[PDB]
Amino acid sequence: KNGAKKTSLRELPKISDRVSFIYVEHAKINRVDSAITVLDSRGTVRIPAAMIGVLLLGPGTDISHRAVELIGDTGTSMVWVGERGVRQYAHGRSLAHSTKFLEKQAKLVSNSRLRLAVARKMYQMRFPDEDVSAMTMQQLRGREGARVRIVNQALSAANVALYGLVHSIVIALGASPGLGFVHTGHDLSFIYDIADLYKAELTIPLAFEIAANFTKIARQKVRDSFVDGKLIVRIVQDIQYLFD
Amino acid sequence: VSFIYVEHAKINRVDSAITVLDSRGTVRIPAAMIGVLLLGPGTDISHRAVELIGDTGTSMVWVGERGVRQYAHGRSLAHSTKFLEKQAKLVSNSRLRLAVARKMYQMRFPDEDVSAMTMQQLRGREGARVRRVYRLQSEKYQVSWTKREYNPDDFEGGDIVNQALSAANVALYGLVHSIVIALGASPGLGFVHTGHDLSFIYDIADLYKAELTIPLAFEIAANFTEIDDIGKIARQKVRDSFVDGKLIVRIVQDIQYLFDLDDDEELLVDTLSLWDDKDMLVKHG
Amino acid sequence: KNGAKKTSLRELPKISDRVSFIYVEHAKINRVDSAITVLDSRGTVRIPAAMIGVLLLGPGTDISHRAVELIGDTGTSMVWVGERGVRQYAHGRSLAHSTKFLEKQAKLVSNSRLRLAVARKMYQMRFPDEDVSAMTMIVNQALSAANVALYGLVHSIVIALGASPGLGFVHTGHDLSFIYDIADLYKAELTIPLAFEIAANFTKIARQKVRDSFVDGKLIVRIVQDIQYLFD
Amino acid sequence: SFIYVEHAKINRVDSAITVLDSRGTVRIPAAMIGVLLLGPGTDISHRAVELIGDTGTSMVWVGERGVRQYAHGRSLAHSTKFLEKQAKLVSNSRLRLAVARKMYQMRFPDEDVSAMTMQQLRGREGARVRRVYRLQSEKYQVSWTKREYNPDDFEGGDIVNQALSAANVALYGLVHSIVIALGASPGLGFVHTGHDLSFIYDIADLYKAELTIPLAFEIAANFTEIDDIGKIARQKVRDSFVDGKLIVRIVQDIQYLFDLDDDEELLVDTLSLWDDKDMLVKHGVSYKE
Amino acid sequence: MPFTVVTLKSVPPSLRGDLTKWMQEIAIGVYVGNFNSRIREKLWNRIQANVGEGEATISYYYRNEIGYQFDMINSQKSVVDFDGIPLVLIPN
Amino acid sequence: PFTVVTLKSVPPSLRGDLTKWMQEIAIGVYVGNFNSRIREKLWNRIQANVGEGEATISYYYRNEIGYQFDMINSQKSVVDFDGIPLVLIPNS
DNA sequence: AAACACCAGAACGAGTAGTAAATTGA
DNA sequence: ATTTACTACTCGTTCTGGTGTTTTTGTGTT
């Protein structure tokens, strides 16, 4: 045996019943006694992995192959961040033994008219109501532009947690971060799309609040926003509606 | 492109280059020479490095011992999706999904030709060929063999051959998964195999099975006994076969030959192996 | 010091957020390390005496002064049951320092007109419907078991408010008259049905039966509200 | 009619009980007990409780010489005469004045008080109380200024504030015991009310002026702070109780404040069948040593 | 989504650090975690097996007349049925 | 809610006291289901009758992870990772 | 390079058995 | 008679550091 065993799927909890995300910096992760570990000056720590959906790893951080082996084996994910933004989305297994979501996602995105229909659905979901959308081709580019038009710190932080939790639920449902209906030309299209639906209603309010209140500080408001909004379920709902 | 393998080392970063500390010594590699980066046991990669890899389109795949396993992965090669979308197209429309099924059933039957036969006769011909090659190698290695009877849970509850057959097929699945995900394709969008998350990979593997793995299992079963750890030595034999890299250059081609991606845009594989000391623009010592 | 400290009033749980009763037999009870211990052949059990409302002390048992001193100080009640029926009660403290229900009880029971009022409201609240109102002046084992558990639980509830068992509108002529009266209400609905279902046995079980009965019926708050709105 | 037991064990034998002390086994039938007090070092059977319940005998669990109460039982012959005569009486704003007047006069024998109002009576009560306080103070040359009843903290306090409190608590306990033994209720009060032990405070205010304050002052005069004043107080009161003359005038005051005739009075007779220095053995107790 | 608590005594270190993936450590041999029934009814068959000679106990939130249930493996503390309620025992 | 206590190096005048509002399911592990004011008074009855030893309590709640807990005089600690409480284990 | 099984011993806390001292926390 | 503080002495469990190994538990055209 020479070790413990790897997890299964019926000993794993869904992402609807989990914590959202953790942060880590100036540390170094490892494996020990069939477990995970963290080590800063303040002292050792440990980390449950079957009760999280995202890890974030900041500067001065190190990590070892035998930890990744373990985290991935649960359904969790890894994300390296910094002063410039997120980077190096990593992930392991997916908590879905069937591929219906990917099949239908491809059946859609192959054709172009269905792609356009779903993109219009999302364009009208981006805005406060239903009849506020516009039935045009590219005037919605200027629409989104005008809608976009010591605070970028909170902007980023929230955007990072958002991207990560999306990535997690996407791979746990069975979708693909590449088969996107907008933003295409990369491998994170479905992610960069699904995240703009909530960037507006989440990032900016508390970002401005913080930037006004000058005297880390954001990640409590971000988690409270998650717990209240119920993102982890509303997103699954949006997706089952967007693909049917 | 260039592929690479690292193990028993400790990575870190310099201005725009890598450093791989080990027992022999240290190395240096500007990141615009790497391509894929197959990490491995005994490796502590840093953060300040990763944020470089990400900024060069380089890939990375936490693997076992010579790709016998796949444990994680990051963003694919150069952040592209050609294979993915051209796979989704071919599998969605049910007229193309056969032009790439009776097309792959051909490359493993070189003599015969089948462009008219359909999805139900293929099955019955494939099955017969496999039943034939199995008995062939059986009577070659003077072994008893009737069929592929087993149970997934009670692995240690059957004959000695099925054990190693399964183990080697699994290591093959592992390497195939690794390379596939490193390119940008998808496992589940399969043509002959349906539903399961790892179908395209079974479909690929069925090409390489009958020339690499059963000639391994039957030997492994003849020259060994019940009081052993056959499930360990199969993995090690396939690890020893995967060293050179005469199966990472066939896969890229057997992929680019299905999706019909052209010749000018093809990929050129190079299974490098560091500490050859014949390189250019690579500090050392 | 020289021992642990006694129980306060805010560290106790109300009688509604509690277990109902626990049985005992052929054992010996004592205080150990400031706890309540029960010894017997099978072994040695300890008792959470603040998450309970009554004990029943069957044959063969022995108990010591320094154990009742501790039980009483919670709100639980001791009762020495027996094959022949119930036997004498015990209670140390009342979980209330108001003395209001008792004031109104005395006020009401002093006179006789509004005593007979409740006397006939008994027949009213007892029998199924109001149209049946008449305002005109092998099974015995389980029957007595349920009746016993009910008597004890009634005693606990009564004392848990400030009330007295001695002021009996009917069954008077004793000190346990009030609880006899209150128990007459829920006897028929609960005692006899299960009594027959058991007396039809082919092989104690009454305890599981009555426990599940009370759990489904909410008997605690039932009786509490009955007494409230019967004295208000 | 009363009894006290300690450092013993009990069991039932043919309508009689069988104690078990160090020296020998006393015995007594189930007719002469009446009331029954129980003290530390007693474990009691089930067949004995059966009798003590099936005969009308009372059963109580008390500290050393009834200085504290721990549990109850039923009442002598299961009667409520005191309870009924207390409830019928307290539920009348007019009839609930004469008994109060009586209680007020038991502490003012020289003057009559069946003309004054309740509000005016507490003034003279406090007057007499402060008078006896200052009197005992000047007698024992003790620095006394006033009372302080803090039911939360005992630490700071004052030596007399500490000893009189404990003596009054022991008195409360014995009164509680006897009261519950008769059949009355401690909540149906006349002067005090709003709490479950008000009748206790009242019927103990009688004896508080002659039994605990002089004791407290003689305690505070010739003792120190390091000593366990709270332990010696209840011990002195236990000694004072061993006699049994205060268990008698209480029952005589109960039957007198509710206006119960003589033919209803009961026999209050203490008993001590086990001594270490005297001989007290007679009349039916068949020592089965 | 009940509350679950697990205790472990004299077990291999390949079960004292694995269980720290679901749960969390507050003291020695004391592991506390919140999750639902299907997960724990698997974790219990996972700990019945790879424990060895040592002991372990589980207790979860429920709805009975007292408010919880529990079970044991290889522990000397038995369990008795006090006419509906579970009470721990300590034999001789 | 559901409450779990842990005692280490305490007088025997607590391991038998606490057995009234709780049960002993293991050695140093006391289990109990009850409400909030009782809990918050016990946690002070225990803070002073402990002496040199150490104890721990954990109760059901409604947070992002699903519980809380408190520690007194332990060599462990408790740290917050941006809203969530996680244990610690310092260095020599 | 990183992480497990194994063994040797060293340190610290739970459990039982007798002695003296009280009847209790006000 | 019952129960607690206090002591000394076993017995057991846990902590920690040096060694020698292995990179890992294994359906998928039955």
Coordinates of N, CA and C (backbone and C1' of nucleotides) in Angstrom, one line a residue, chain B residues 4-31 33-34 37 49 52 272-285, chain G residues 1:
Chain B
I4 N 9.7 18.4 -23.0 CA 10.7 18.3 -22.0 C 10.2 17.5 -20.8
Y5 N 11.1 17.0 -20.0 CA 10.7 16.2 -18.8 C 11.7 16.6 -17.7
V6 N 11.1 16.8 -16.5 CA 11.9 17.2 -15.3 C 11.5 16.4 -14.2
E7 N 12.4 16.0 -13.4 CA 12.2 15.2 -12.2 C 13.4 15.4 -11.2
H8 N 13.1 15.1 -9.9 CA 14.1 15.2 -8.9 C 14.9 16.6 -9.0
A9 N 14.1 17.7 -8.9 CA 14.7 19.0 -9.1 C 13.9 20.0 -8.3
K10 N 14.4 21.3 -8.4 CA 13.8 22.4 -7.7 C 13.9 23.6 -8.6
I11 N 12.8 24.0 -9.2 CA 12.8 25.1 -10.1 C 12.7 26.4 -9.4
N12 N 13.2 27.5 -10.1 CA 13.1 28.9 -9.7 C 13.4 29.7 -10.9
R13 N 13.4 31.0 -10.7 CA 13.4 31.9 -11.9 C 14.6 32.9 -11.8
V14 N 15.0 33.4 -13.0 CA 16.0 34.4 -13.2 C 15.2 35.4 -14.1
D15 N 15.9 36.5 -14.4 CA 15.2 37.6 -15.1 C 14.2 37.1 -16.1
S16 N 14.6 36.4 -17.1 CA 13.7 35.8 -18.1 C 14.1 34.4 -18.5
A17 N 14.4 33.6 -17.5 CA 14.9 32.3 -17.8 C 14.6 31.4 -16.6
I18 N 14.8 30.1 -16.7 CA 14.5 29.1 -15.7 C 15.8 28.6 -15.1
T19 N 15.7 28.0 -13.9 CA 16.9 27.3 -13.3 C 16.4 26.0 -12.6
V20 N 17.1 24.9 -12.9 CA 16.7 23.6 -12.5 C 17.8 23.0 -11.6
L21 N 17.7 23.2 -10.3 CA 18.7 22.7 -9.4 C 18.5 21.2 -9.2
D22 N 19.6 20.4 -9.1 CA 19.6 19.0 -9.0 C 20.9 18.5 -8.3
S23 N 21.1 17.2 -8.3 CA 22.3 16.6 -7.7 C 23.5 16.9 -8.6
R24 N 23.4 16.5 -9.9 CA 24.4 16.8 -10.9 C 24.8 18.3 -10.8
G25 N 23.9 19.2 -10.9 CA 24.1 20.6 -10.8 C 22.9 21.4 -11.2
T26 N 23.2 22.6 -11.7 CA 22.1 23.5 -12.1 C 22.1 23.7 -13.6
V27 N 21.0 24.3 -14.2 CA 20.8 24.5 -15.6 C 20.2 25.8 -15.8
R28 N 20.1 26.3 -17.0 CA 19.4 27.5 -17.4 C 18.8 27.3 -18.7
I29 N 17.5 27.8 -18.9 CA 16.8 27.6 -20.1 C 15.8 28.8 -20.3
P30 N 16.2 29.7 -21.2 CA 15.2 30.8 -21.5 C 13.9 30.2 -22.1
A31 N 12.8 30.7 -21.5 CA 11.5 30.0 -21.7 C 11.0 29.9 -23.1
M33 N 12.1 28.3 -25.4 CA 12.7 27.1 -26.0 C 12.1 25.8 -25.5
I34 N 11.0 25.9 -24.7 CA 10.5 24.8 -23.9 C 9.3 24.1 -24.5
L37 N 6.1 21.3 -20.7 CA 6.9 21.1 -19.5 C 6.3 20.0 -18.7
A49 N 8.3 31.9 -10.9 CA 8.5 31.2 -12.2 C 7.2 31.1 -13.0
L52 N 6.0 33.5 -15.2 CA 6.7 33.6 -16.5 C 6.1 32.7 -17.6
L272 N 13.1 16.3 -26.2 CA 14.4 16.6 -25.6 C 14.6 15.9 -24.3
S273 N 15.8 15.9 -23.9 CA 16.2 15.3 -22.6 C 17.5 16.0 -22.1
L274 N 17.3 17.0 -21.2 CA 18.3 17.9 -20.6 C 19.5 17.2 -20.1
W275 N 20.6 17.9 -20.0 CA 21.9 17.4 -19.7 C 22.5 16.6 -20.8
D276 N 22.1 16.9 -22.1 CA 22.9 16.5 -23.2 C 24.1 17.4 -23.5
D277 N 24.0 18.6 -22.9 CA 25.1 19.6 -23.0 C 25.4 20.1 -24.4
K278 N 24.6 19.8 -25.4 CA 24.7 20.3 -26.7 C 23.5 21.2 -27.0
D279 N 23.6 22.4 -26.6 CA 22.5 23.4 -26.8 C 23.1 24.8 -27.1
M280 N 22.2 25.7 -27.5 CA 22.6 27.0 -27.9 C 21.9 28.0 -27.0
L281 N 22.6 29.0 -26.5 CA 22.0 30.1 -25.6 C 21.5 29.5 -24.3
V282 N 22.2 28.6 -23.8 CA 21.9 27.9 -22.5 C 23.1 27.9 -21.6
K283 N 23.1 28.8 -20.6 CA 24.1 28.8 -19.6 C 24.1 27.4 -18.9
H284 N 25.2 27.1 -18.2 CA 25.3 25.8 -17.6 C 26.4 25.9 -16.5
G285 N 26.3 24.9 -15.6 CA 27.3 24.8 -14.5 C 26.8 25.5 -13.3
Chain G
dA1 O5' 17.7 18.2 -3.7 C5' 16.8 18.8 -4.6 C4' 15.5 18.1 -4.6 C3' 14.9 18.0 -3.2 O3' 13.8 18.9 -3.0 C1' 14.5 16.0 -4.5

